[PDB]
Amino acid sequence: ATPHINAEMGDFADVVLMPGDPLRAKYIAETFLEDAREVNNVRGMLGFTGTYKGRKISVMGHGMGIPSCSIYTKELITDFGVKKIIRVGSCGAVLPHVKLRDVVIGMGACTDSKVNRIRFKDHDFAAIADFDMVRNAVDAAKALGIDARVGNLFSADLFYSPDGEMFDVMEKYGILGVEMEAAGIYGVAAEFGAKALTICTVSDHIRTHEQTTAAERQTTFNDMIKIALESVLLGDK
Amino acid sequence: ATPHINAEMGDFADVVLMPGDPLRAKYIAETFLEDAREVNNVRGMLGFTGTYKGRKISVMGHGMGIPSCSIYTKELITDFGVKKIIRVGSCGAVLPHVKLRDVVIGMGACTDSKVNRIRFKDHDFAAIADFDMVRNAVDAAKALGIDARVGNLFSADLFYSPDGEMFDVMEKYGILGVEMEAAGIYGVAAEFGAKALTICTVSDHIRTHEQTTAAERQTTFNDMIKIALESVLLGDK
Amino acid sequence: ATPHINAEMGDFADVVLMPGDPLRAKYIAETFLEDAREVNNVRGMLGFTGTYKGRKISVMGHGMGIPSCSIYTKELITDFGVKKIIRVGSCGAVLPHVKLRDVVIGMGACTDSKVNRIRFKDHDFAAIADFDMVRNAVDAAKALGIDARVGNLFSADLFYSPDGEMFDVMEKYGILGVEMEAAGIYGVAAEFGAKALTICTVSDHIRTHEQTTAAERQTTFNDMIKIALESVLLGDK
Amino acid sequence: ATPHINAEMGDFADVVLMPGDPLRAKYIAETFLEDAREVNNVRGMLGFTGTYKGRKISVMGHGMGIPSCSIYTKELITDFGVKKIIRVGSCGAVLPHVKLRDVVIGMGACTDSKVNRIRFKDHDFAAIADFDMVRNAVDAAKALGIDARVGNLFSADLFYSPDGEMFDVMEKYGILGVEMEAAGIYGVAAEFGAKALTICTVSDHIRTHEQTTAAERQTTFNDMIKIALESVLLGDK
Amino acid sequence: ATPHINAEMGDFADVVLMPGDPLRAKYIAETFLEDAREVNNVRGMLGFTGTYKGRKISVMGHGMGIPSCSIYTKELITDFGVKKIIRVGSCGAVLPHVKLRDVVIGMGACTDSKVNRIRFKDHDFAAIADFDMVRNAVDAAKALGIDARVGNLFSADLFYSPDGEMFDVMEKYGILGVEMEAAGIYGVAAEFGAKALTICTVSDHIRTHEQTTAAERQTTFNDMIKIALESVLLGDK
Amino acid sequence: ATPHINAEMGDFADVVLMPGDPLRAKYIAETFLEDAREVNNVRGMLGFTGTYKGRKISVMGHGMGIPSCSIYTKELITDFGVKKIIRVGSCGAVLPHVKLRDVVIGMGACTDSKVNRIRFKDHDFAAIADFDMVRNAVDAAKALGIDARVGNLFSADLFYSPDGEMFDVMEKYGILGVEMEAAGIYGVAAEFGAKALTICTVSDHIRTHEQTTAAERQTTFNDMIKIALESVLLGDK
Ligand SMILES: Nc1ncnc2c1ncn2[C@@H]1O[C@H](CO)[C@@H](O)[C@H]1O
Ligand SMILES: Nc1ncnc2c1ncn2[C@@H]1O[C@H](CO)[C@@H](O)[C@H]1O
Ligand SMILES: Nc1ncnc2c1ncn2[C@@H]1O[C@H](CO)[C@@H](O)[C@H]1O
Ligand SMILES: Nc1ncnc2c1ncn2[C@@H]1O[C@H](CO)[C@@H](O)[C@H]1O
Ligand SMILES: Nc1ncnc2c1ncn2[C@@H]1O[C@H](CO)[C@@H](O)[C@H]1O
Ligand SMILES: Nc1ncnc2c1ncn2[C@@H]1O[C@H](CO)[C@@H](O)[C@H]1O
């Protein structure tokens, strides 16, 4: 077992899908996995294991923020033999040509955190995903008919930022969406030698919030998950 | 109803106790509060409100990490009329003469996070707790005949630090315990004008690696809740 | 005899009061201490030792600035057996509801200096005062029927700041007063294991530019000394 | 005509290859481009424009360092309508498994430079290449049966770094090759909305170097240019 | 008058010599000035005005540290019409080929303070003296027979440094001596448009402290002062 | 033979002039040096060695930017026994009184680069020229009846700075000219114990530029080289 995960070696697949919300991790195991079993529930951070089209897959929440997801991804990679981590979450839009319900894939992730400077002797560590995972994700989305955008994400430490003028900067350097974990997970993946990726759906538009209809918002979230799950099979081949 | 809290103005008391563990909030509600009802469950971040010796009080977890508890403490303060926040969590010991199960009262909190530098034009902001609350707790402890060291805590962004040499520095400066939220909570309290205090139970020792055990886990965590609840009454006097 | 203090082990009491003004130390020795003798005059940094209501106490200025008071507090602590240090100085007000002659008790001290970042591996060190001393003073004040706000001070390196916009930031965060030594003294106290507290008399207002006047200068500065001297006795009880 | 480029709008193609040595721009124009024509000579920075299998292509050296390549790539993007920039050159390996003559593609570029911090409000900007250009280069290499590795690069400001342990860090974080431009080129592209890529060949292994001949070394170089050239065409579809 | 200087326009010469110690400023007025009058004594920081070989000159202490000397030099330049400031003090040796009783002139001054970064938007401001003053000083020392060294000084914030390994760095980059004000005065001079210079005599050798004989040490301090005073006359011509 | 300089020890004189444009190294060798002989061609960085009035002198371009000039000046100092380095070039004025064609001598060089911070433990290193070389250049100019100004220069990493108010700061602190090498050359000299100087001519006034002819512009340039050349001889005594 582990300080934050009460399970044993074998309980998880070598691939773990991670939503920020635990209740959302249960929703995924319910909707897409066959024969899903709960493998952890410490602090209410639900984790499940099952199979998709015959492939052993796991899904577990990682909580909000870099400090939170860092603890979990680290314990999985170094104590449960996990090799891949695909974060499937939500992000806010900054660029105008980016619309609600757009699937974005973070090849890289900018940040206002200090975690990577701490690991990188205070220089700039470019937090990036695994190239193959990005490609698998891009090819799966195409098969499903979705036109995914691949670029930079911004991982913020303050959801309720004091500044706000930093949003002008993000849009200027082409940031595709803002969330809160990418840069942290990538930093962890680099540190312990595993592979990670982050896919997001635009939850709202910083510029002008607002959304469409629940039915459509939920269809796009499912499209994202199918791309995540399908990209894995694709990577097995 | 806020982005992460599904409740209406009135569901929460003007005073909230906050453990990182959602399940611990529930354990507290079931053991110390009377006629307590659940006011939140969004993202499983369970919140409760009942009464303690007549007084109305609430308890809700904040998850792990500064960015996590920042969101929660901020929404309660600006959309639910919360005036006091008392985090009740666990920490790691760095000093030899600091035992497991020990109770520490953070008058201040150091940190390796950037949230505060972003707020204070990159200068050093002394994240300190509210004085009266620090005193109410010190008294509540003396009345309960319980021990409690008052001092500096260290709010870390990385539970699994890549720089262990920083623990000597933490020790050299007498840091009582290592947790992950204090400096963030104290930062937000100041930003939105509120009062906060952090109380912690030494759950483990960083040098000796000794992790909690026996039924001395709960009980010790029962004194921490005792002191917090009682320190509120003194504050009401 | 240290590099900047010409005295021998024993000349100083275990408790020293320290104003920035050397002449003020002398005024204090002549008005509050009994059978006081001069123990230092190197660089004109006058030091005195006498008794107050039976207790042996010393008073010596520290000059202006963190680097200045750092030298002095460090030599007293390591070569004269000093255990407590209580700075008694003046500060500038930033908040509207903070009047001239007001007494502030620095529980913490923010800063734009680098001395602490150099000590804390470039992280945020919460420079806080010793808790019991903060309490002894708050009581000494209540007994004297004197008012005294307890909170954060701001230790500036530049009295004539080139960035006045930082005062809004200081205000926004409720900084009680602007002085130039607190964070340095609290830093040294921690480094060489000692206890310190800073008490200040609002000598001017940064917004209104109102500078002290009338015979209300001295007297107000007489309450500050009163509280300090008395807070020591309480601490002896 | 820009300050450093004496030529008119239309002289350069929408795509430009950039070697370090300006002498290399000539070799490429003569060894690979059809109907070539010099288009710049300022400061000796030789630049040509020709065609590769019907596709108009330009080639021009950029000098050593981020400050240099930054002015060139900027003027081209803002004053000659350049849409894509492919940098070709050499780098030093730090990983044991990365061998001399290995081809490396910088999907991302770390750096010890401050240019991006100055651009991104002193936060962490992830300098990444354009995903499609990356994928094109990989596919094109596969076509030529060459083995290309996709990862992080490190843009050092000092070819002679007074610091040595920094190479240990780079290794620990899987840096593929060390060079001096990628991070600067990526920041500019992001700044003025253009696409860029960096492809390198391991010239030296810093740690342990073998012995490459000028014969082998030109083959690898020509292999890199074919990869860069064929990738454009794929990019074209 | 001024907050720290109780004098009036006209009381000081347009040239001010400033030793760190006030008692030393009186020693200078006594030994080298004709018809010297005390023009300030606030906080015991003695200031004098008189003439040398018919030239009106002033001399006043500036206290220890950048925060201290910054307040005084600023008040003199902007409230008492001072145009030149020559700091005459003591410094510690770092380079072996630098011997006790060597007169060093700081053309520039490195620092561990954060004052200049605050004035210079966080970049590197090279704190330097006025070229003519450096030359006058160099020519005067020659007339007197002294062989002055002209180079860099290091202005420290912590006289009792936590590090100490920074001394290896200073010697490596050729620092001539370490004191505590130069960088601050130069920053002030640049900010308010006046001219400043710093001359120092090696008080000891960090490498191996120790000194010669009082008679010789005091002869060299007087040589320094004569160079300071003589350089002024030289500058008048 | 160094990585960037294909030549042997003895090929370069103890003194080397360095222009930005490598084409300029040729013009100087032919227009001013006797018995000139090319000594390097790598990457097109042309370098020559001849004599000026019996004095052996070398000339070679260094490229644009601190990262570039840093490798060249380093290899020369450590591998060809170069004792002094004089950089000659142009810069942009930011002060109103500094006119086009004005000659400027950088006694110091500010910068927005991180190279010196990386070298000096993240503290402020004052990048200064060698005082005697500075004085020689001034005297030599006077001889040629030219008006030279001695002050601070600013070494910008980005010729196209996204930040604009930074020019206001530079003006406020009396910066004389903006360029891109001085601070890097000075850091290297300090690092390997050598002497260096930078002399510039105002080419543009950034703010308001007039109209200089290629006729006038060459005269100023030749005036600068005579100053640089005559100063060496004075340096020789
Ligand atoms: N504009 C935004 N700023 C910060 N986090 C955001 C934003 N939009 C969506 N998120 C993400 O969604 C959650 C908060 O609602 C977090 O998990 C965070 O990653
Ligand atoms: N040794 C430790 N280091 C850091 N955080 C700790 C430690 N022990 C307990 N914690 C706390 O518990 C959680 C991490 O397990 C966080 O909420 C943090 O406050
Ligand atoms: N407005 C102010 N700003 C900064 N320091 C002040 C101010 N007013 C009083 N002080 C204090 O008095 C001295 C400067 O006059 C320092 O010792 C400092 O603590
Ligand atoms: N080992 C290496 N370290 C740093 N830069 C290198 C190295 N090998 C090749 N280069 C590259 O070649 C040039 C320096 O010779 C620079 O343009 C740089 O990108
Ligand atoms: N080694 C040293 N470190 C710091 N300050 C020094 C040193 N040697 C001499 N000084 C100077 O002398 C005084 C302290 O004795 C201060 O004014 C300071 O400038
Ligand atoms: N206005 C200017 N700004 C920045 N660098 C300049 C300027 N004018 C001339 N230069 C110099 O000339 C080159 C850029 O054209 C660089 O080597 C730089 O030193």
Short mmCIF file of C-alpha atoms in Angstrom, two decimals, chain E residues 46-235:
data_model
loop_
_atom_site.label_atom_id
_atom_site.label_comp_id
_atom_site.label_asym_id
_atom_site.label_seq_id
_atom_site.Cartn_x
_atom_site.Cartn_y
_atom_site.Cartn_z
CA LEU E 46 27.65 63.85 13.49
CA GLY E 47 28.13 66.14 10.50
CA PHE E 48 30.70 68.92 10.11
CA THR E 49 31.56 71.76 7.74
CA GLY E 50 34.88 73.54 7.32
CA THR E 51 37.59 74.17 4.74
CA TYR E 52 40.72 72.43 3.48
CA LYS E 53 43.40 74.60 1.90
CA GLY E 54 40.69 77.22 1.49
CA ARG E 55 38.05 74.88 -0.02
CA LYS E 56 34.66 74.42 1.70
CA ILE E 57 34.31 70.71 2.58
CA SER E 58 31.91 68.72 4.78
CA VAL E 59 32.20 65.37 6.50
CA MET E 60 29.43 63.19 7.96
CA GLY E 61 28.94 59.58 9.00
CA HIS E 62 26.43 57.42 7.13
CA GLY E 63 25.91 54.49 9.49
CA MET E 64 26.35 50.79 8.66
CA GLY E 65 24.58 49.26 5.68
CA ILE E 66 22.91 50.23 2.43
CA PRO E 67 19.53 51.11 4.03
CA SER E 68 21.33 53.54 6.35
CA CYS E 69 23.69 55.34 3.98
CA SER E 70 20.89 55.50 1.37
CA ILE E 71 18.71 57.72 3.58
CA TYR E 72 21.52 60.20 4.26
CA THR E 73 23.04 60.50 0.80
CA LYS E 74 19.51 60.99 -0.57
CA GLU E 75 18.62 63.75 1.88
CA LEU E 76 21.92 65.54 1.16
CA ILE E 77 21.63 65.40 -2.64
CA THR E 78 17.99 66.47 -2.74
CA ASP E 79 17.69 68.77 0.28
CA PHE E 80 21.13 70.29 0.88
CA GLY E 81 22.30 70.67 -2.71
CA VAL E 82 25.17 68.19 -2.45
CA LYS E 83 26.70 67.23 -5.79
CA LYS E 84 29.50 64.83 -4.77
CA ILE E 85 29.80 62.12 -2.16
CA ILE E 86 33.07 60.36 -1.36
CA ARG E 87 32.73 57.41 0.99
CA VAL E 88 35.96 56.82 2.91
CA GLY E 89 35.77 53.53 4.79
CA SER E 90 37.14 50.11 5.65
CA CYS E 91 36.91 46.77 3.79
CA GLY E 92 38.00 43.13 4.05
CA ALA E 93 40.45 41.52 1.62
CA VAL E 94 39.59 38.48 -0.52
CA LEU E 95 42.38 38.31 -3.13
CA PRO E 96 45.81 37.13 -1.90
CA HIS E 97 47.80 39.73 -3.86
CA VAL E 98 45.89 42.37 -1.89
CA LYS E 99 47.66 43.34 1.34
CA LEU E 100 46.69 45.07 4.57
CA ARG E 101 46.78 48.84 4.26
CA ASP E 102 46.15 48.92 0.50
CA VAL E 103 44.03 51.80 -0.76
CA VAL E 104 41.30 50.48 -3.03
CA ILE E 105 38.99 52.57 -5.21
CA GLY E 106 35.68 51.07 -6.25
CA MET E 107 35.00 51.84 -9.91
CA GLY E 108 32.08 49.46 -9.50
CA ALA E 109 30.37 47.55 -6.70
CA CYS E 110 28.71 44.12 -6.67
CA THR E 111 25.99 43.33 -4.12
CA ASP E 112 23.72 40.75 -2.48
CA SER E 113 21.13 43.43 -1.75
CA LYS E 114 17.88 43.75 -3.69
CA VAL E 115 17.66 47.58 -3.77
CA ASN E 116 18.97 48.09 -7.32
CA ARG E 117 16.87 45.25 -8.79
CA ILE E 118 13.92 47.04 -7.27
CA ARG E 119 14.92 50.25 -9.06
CA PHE E 120 15.92 48.45 -12.25
CA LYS E 121 12.84 46.33 -12.99
CA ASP E 122 14.66 43.24 -11.73
CA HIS E 123 17.54 43.29 -14.23
CA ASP E 124 21.25 43.95 -13.59
CA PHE E 125 22.12 47.56 -12.90
CA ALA E 126 25.89 47.99 -12.89
CA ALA E 127 26.51 50.21 -9.87
CA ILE E 128 29.47 52.42 -10.80
CA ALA E 129 31.19 55.59 -9.60
CA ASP E 130 31.76 58.83 -11.48
CA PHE E 131 34.68 58.34 -13.87
CA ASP E 132 36.20 61.75 -13.18
CA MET E 133 36.10 61.23 -9.43
CA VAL E 134 37.85 57.87 -9.87
CA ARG E 135 40.52 59.56 -11.98
CA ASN E 136 40.96 62.50 -9.58
CA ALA E 137 41.34 59.97 -6.78
CA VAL E 138 43.87 57.97 -8.79
CA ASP E 139 45.93 61.06 -9.62
CA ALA E 140 45.90 62.41 -6.07
CA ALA E 141 47.07 59.08 -4.65
CA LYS E 142 49.93 59.12 -7.14
CA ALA E 143 51.08 62.60 -6.06
CA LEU E 144 51.12 61.38 -2.45
CA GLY E 145 53.15 58.34 -3.47
CA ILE E 146 50.44 55.69 -2.98
CA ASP E 147 49.73 52.92 -5.52
CA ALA E 148 45.92 52.61 -5.40
CA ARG E 149 44.08 49.59 -6.80
CA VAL E 150 40.98 50.27 -8.90
CA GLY E 151 38.39 47.53 -9.28
CA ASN E 152 35.23 45.95 -7.89
CA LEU E 153 33.97 46.02 -4.32
CA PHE E 154 31.24 43.79 -2.91
CA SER E 155 28.56 45.44 -0.76
CA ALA E 156 27.16 42.79 1.58
CA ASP E 157 23.91 42.86 3.53
CA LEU E 158 25.05 40.25 6.06
CA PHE E 159 28.37 41.03 7.83
CA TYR E 160 27.98 37.68 9.55
CA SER E 161 27.12 35.68 6.45
CA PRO E 162 25.32 32.30 6.62
CA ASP E 163 27.12 31.16 3.45
CA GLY E 164 30.79 32.05 3.39
CA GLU E 165 31.33 30.01 0.24
CA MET E 166 30.35 33.18 -1.60
CA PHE E 167 33.86 34.37 -0.68
CA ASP E 168 35.28 31.77 -3.07
CA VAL E 169 33.15 33.32 -5.80
CA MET E 170 34.24 36.89 -5.00
CA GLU E 171 37.92 36.01 -5.17
CA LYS E 172 37.27 34.15 -8.44
CA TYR E 173 35.78 37.21 -10.16
CA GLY E 174 38.47 39.51 -8.79
CA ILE E 175 36.61 41.43 -6.06
CA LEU E 176 39.11 43.80 -4.40
CA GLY E 177 37.42 44.23 -1.04
CA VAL E 178 34.14 43.68 0.75
CA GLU E 179 32.29 46.40 2.66
CA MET E 180 28.62 47.34 3.04
CA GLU E 181 27.59 50.56 1.33
CA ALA E 182 29.10 51.21 -2.12
CA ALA E 183 26.35 49.57 -4.22
CA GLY E 184 23.73 51.48 -2.23
CA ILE E 185 25.32 54.91 -2.60
CA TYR E 186 25.93 54.38 -6.32
CA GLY E 187 22.31 53.31 -6.74
CA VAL E 188 21.19 56.50 -4.99
CA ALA E 189 23.59 58.67 -7.04
CA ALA E 190 22.20 57.22 -10.25
CA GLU E 191 18.62 57.70 -9.09
CA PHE E 192 18.88 61.38 -8.11
CA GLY E 193 21.59 62.50 -10.49
CA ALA E 194 24.60 63.28 -8.29
CA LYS E 195 28.18 61.92 -8.34
CA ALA E 196 29.67 59.42 -5.90
CA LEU E 197 32.89 57.52 -5.19
CA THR E 198 34.13 55.02 -2.58
CA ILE E 199 37.71 54.63 -1.35
CA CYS E 200 38.68 51.94 1.17
CA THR E 201 41.68 50.67 3.10
CA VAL E 202 41.96 46.92 3.73
CA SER E 203 41.04 46.50 7.41
CA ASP E 204 41.78 42.79 7.38
CA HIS E 205 42.17 39.79 5.10
CA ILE E 206 39.18 37.44 5.03
CA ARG E 207 41.65 34.75 4.02
CA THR E 208 43.83 35.33 7.10
CA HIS E 209 42.59 38.40 9.07
CA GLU E 210 45.41 39.87 11.20
CA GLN E 211 47.03 43.33 10.92
CA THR E 212 50.35 45.16 11.44
CA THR E 213 50.92 48.03 13.90
CA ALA E 214 48.48 50.74 14.99
CA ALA E 215 50.90 53.44 13.90
CA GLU E 216 50.97 52.07 10.35
CA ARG E 217 47.23 51.32 10.16
CA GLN E 218 46.46 54.90 11.19
CA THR E 219 48.96 56.37 8.71
CA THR E 220 47.22 54.59 5.85
CA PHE E 221 43.78 55.77 6.97
CA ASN E 222 45.14 59.31 6.87
CA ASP E 223 46.65 58.72 3.42
CA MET E 224 43.20 57.67 2.22
CA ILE E 225 41.60 60.85 3.61
CA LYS E 226 44.26 63.07 2.03
CA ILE E 227 43.56 61.39 -1.32
CA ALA E 228 39.87 62.04 -0.85
CA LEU E 229 40.34 65.70 0.09
CA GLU E 230 43.05 66.28 -2.54
CA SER E 231 41.00 64.63 -5.30
CA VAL E 232 38.36 67.31 -4.74
CA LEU E 233 40.70 70.25 -5.30
CA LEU E 234 42.00 68.38 -8.32
CA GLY E 235 38.43 68.14 -9.61
#
